[PDB]
């Protein structure tokens, strides 16, 4: 959800 990782879900 609110994971600030750039490789997280961008959709």
């Amino acid at each position, epitope marked *: 959800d609110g*994971n600030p*990782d*750039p*490789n*997280a*879900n*961008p*959709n």
Partner: antibody
Amino acid sequence: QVLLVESGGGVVQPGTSLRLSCVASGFSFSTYGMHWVRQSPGKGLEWVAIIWYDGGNKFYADSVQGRFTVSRDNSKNTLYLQMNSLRAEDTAVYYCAKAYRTSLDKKYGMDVWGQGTTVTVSS
Amino acid sequence: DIQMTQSPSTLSASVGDRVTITCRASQSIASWLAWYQQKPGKAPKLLIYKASSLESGVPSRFSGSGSGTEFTLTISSLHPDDFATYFCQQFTSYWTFGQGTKVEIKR
């Protein structure tokens, strides 16, 4: 049927500005994140920028940080890349890529790329 | 932020031969690796995602294997449509690619 087509490339003089455009079709552009990747003969393929589906979260490479700006208009289904303060090492083919499908995974890459638009910086 | 190195840089083989391209990472990327194929003048096309999963429509002769720091791509029977330049990408810490491996036709 997922088809991305880039535009805006050309020959620019160093220190000027250029806005590239990527048009989408065959999928829900609003529900997907997008990437910009460039390929020069020397440095090879190099990631440039990612933008979130809503246009909120934007991340860049440190080489283009402070100069390049990514944006999108989900009403026109078009992705943008405003390149400012252009230097000779920014001369490459620029591709726009669509992110991978939402899953139970925590790390995501790219699946479909576009043809590409060529940017040449010269005097 | 993770460096990706490929080997060999150029590979010569004949049609029907088995070839294997190795892709090494500076630190562990688990299985967050993808394999691309690029023919000159065209965009890269994704063949394998998450190290081993073939994407739709890619022939079963392509295979991926590996985890952590070293990965491999293996074509069991090279077809005249498989001779191209191959890149590997990690997608756990931003997105970085390998130098590339060009498959050339031995004659």
